[model samples]
Target: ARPCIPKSFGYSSVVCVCNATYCDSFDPPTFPALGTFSRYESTRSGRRMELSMGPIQANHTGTGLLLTLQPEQKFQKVKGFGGAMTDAAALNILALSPPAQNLLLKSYFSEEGIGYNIIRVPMASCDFSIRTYTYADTPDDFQLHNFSLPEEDTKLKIPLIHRALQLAQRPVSLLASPWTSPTWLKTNGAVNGKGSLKGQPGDIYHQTWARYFVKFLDAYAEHKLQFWAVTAENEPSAGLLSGYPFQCLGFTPEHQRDFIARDLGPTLANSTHHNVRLLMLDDQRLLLPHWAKVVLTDPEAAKYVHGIAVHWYLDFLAPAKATLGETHRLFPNTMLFASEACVGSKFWEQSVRLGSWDRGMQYSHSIITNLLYHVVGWTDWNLALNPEGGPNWVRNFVDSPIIVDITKDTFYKQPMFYHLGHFSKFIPEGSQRVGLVASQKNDLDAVALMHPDGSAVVVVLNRSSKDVPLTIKDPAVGFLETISPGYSIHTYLWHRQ
Candidate 1:
């Protein structure tokens, strides 16, 4: 018996025998099962975009958007995808009934969920926390003996994190970031509102703050939770606040460089948890090149740093690829992780954007562009928020994928959830982002990843209101010609030869 010969077209259409030993020899490469999840409807009309399954095949007809894949041209090993576990998110989950809580966690962490394997946590307190507080509040505790985890986190946040880990049934990478050091360590001696760290390089306060990170790791370890990495500061460039806000410790480029080189770097390097990665600049992308040049160029600072952690807030200022590509070119060894992102205050009045398709499209577009820019992992801002967008102390609420109605003891799986699942549910950890060239631009966006298990995940997003026909061709998997629905996102998976 001989193998079936598959058809082909475009640049080189000659019959190229499949890699018999490496591929499914008996059958010609076929499109893997199609899993479609969409939320094209809105809250005004009705909620739509449920996960549906179907089968598709290759077509060599009409003029459609052409998405070509080059498996050989791979870049960046994907760490994984997940959302942050903020105080509000944890508290909202706890506010629900026990069964409702389990249902929500299963929707995000279990195999039936979006399969989140990476999560970001606030080191002390961020705007999303119930209140502004640090693990260590004692003034001049230079010896570092008065550090502890807040009871709210122990009873609220940590337990949820533990549950997520249990449901994931896999090693979930936790990246912890501090919003501000203790008030005693800040120049203003106040935790809330805008402030900066006290003193300069070799300052006792800077050294104490660096050691405080170690104390955090040790404290979490007491609960049998180990963090995979720690960011020096969250939004180091944003300091001014017109109204009351949560803890924010600003760091000038010089301040950040000195702290990591002289304090955080050396402190973490010598600590028992030395293996924990150190990610810098948990801020926006527009500052990537400048920040990377200032800090990563220094041999002393680069020695202790693992990669750049970015947030997607200021992406409209410039395309992420512009800055991220520059950063990657400058420091090729460093990885890029999209640490936090969500719809900002622009959607304030319509917070939560219940069943909003445009909101989901925002994420799809950003994730595609970030991947193209060499981002290894992507994490959302909050895992779950209340129906009001948050229980934020500062009232700085934002949208999330899963929104819980504590009153009803149920949760709304926003379009954002399935939009995220389009990637996280298919593209597993350790998958390498492969090359994808798209002929059509604007409304259509795409990205591809090659999994270690000899499979591929190709994502296509159509943000326009018109259906765009496209032919996705892979040398090993043959061709898949499909029409991308108007204002929808789709992910296609197939085994690679």
Candidate 2:
């Protein structure tokens, strides 16, 4: 809606600075009417969502790596794109002045913003918190009579989330993910990794943990904030692997299957809040077909399961075609959601790399590649964080799309923020991923979608060093040609009468 206030951070991308009055948002283009087209481009050389609308033309010469969309060959239906709302993310946003807070929220959730409609909220404490805690720590209460939502939820996280819901233009979905169950009920009797539900799947401990999930949902309902979905646990595999630095609960595929069938699923279906969706396997890609197959193959558990969740942390370790694709083929009806992702989690690199364009491309490439293999929705780890990348008690910092400078009462939109807009801003919910028959080279990749209203969208990410001339031919209409600059992203939208 407004122009970027650029400030150099001595990186390849200029950070868009926002004070109380002037934070930038994308200028959303009007949908192309019948027989017309629209185009928006954001380049690495520093261009935001620049718009260029025109008429669809005839395919004269089939030139420049011909790309075409087959709208009839539809695949997965996109849920939406969003960022996580952690205690750390909420604190950063609230630190700014009220006016600045609204500007930042408007820049993400409003129609003029990137139009993010999905919000991933950690049900309790996660690594991105000032300290470690949970909803209820009472050790001996089997009935969980002492269960209460933490101040982090009632005071910080919920208020910011409510504001986002108010600003969001689309039907937003809230995904609740718990970092760990009550440590009292966990195997190691500790908060930080290496713990699982203490008893067998349907025992008193597991039953209490199941109630913990429903209780969290019910408490949110008291505030009139409804959760659309819930992950079984955040990084359910990390606890047993090597132990996460922060709070986490472990769940093997078999253990999760039995737990869902015997405890979680039944409690969920019996609750007054029966509509909340359940997605399991909130871990890495390496567990895909095996994880999904084990849990979903059981008819009892599969009946109550709605989807499978994956994290992008280990995406490089497993190819999407083999992992995500194989899972999709086996359970074609189950939804595939990328539940969590961030730029830096490894201790080897700097946590917060300010104004890094390559980091932005990392995000884009992850989204494009995952979407191609039937991934429905993608969620970034945090909405906004302090310049340090967190207030994490575990000191597990990572770069966020927006970084707040509390001392200055301003926030900077990193290139990663704009990278998200290259898709989230235009791709409306209910849009289906149609066939995009364009071979990806070492540096070029693209995805096509058919809007609910019959419009076609093609998002191209050209990471090659040199500009690549490409033509997108919608056989029903005509071809739209343009030279996509290297290390840039483009979104093309059009429709036929």
Provide TM-scores for the models: 0.88, 0.97
Residue 36's lDDT within candidate 1 is 24
Q: What lDDT is obtained when candidate 1 is compared to the true structure?
A: 0.75
Instruction: Output the number of the lDDT-best candidate.
Output: 2
- Per-residue CA lDDT of model 1 for 278-349, tens digit only, reads 999988888879999999888899898998999985225567657999899988999999999868566434
- Which residue pairs show backbone clashes in model 1? 38-49
Quick one: best TM-score, which candidate? 2
lDDT of 1 at 179: 87
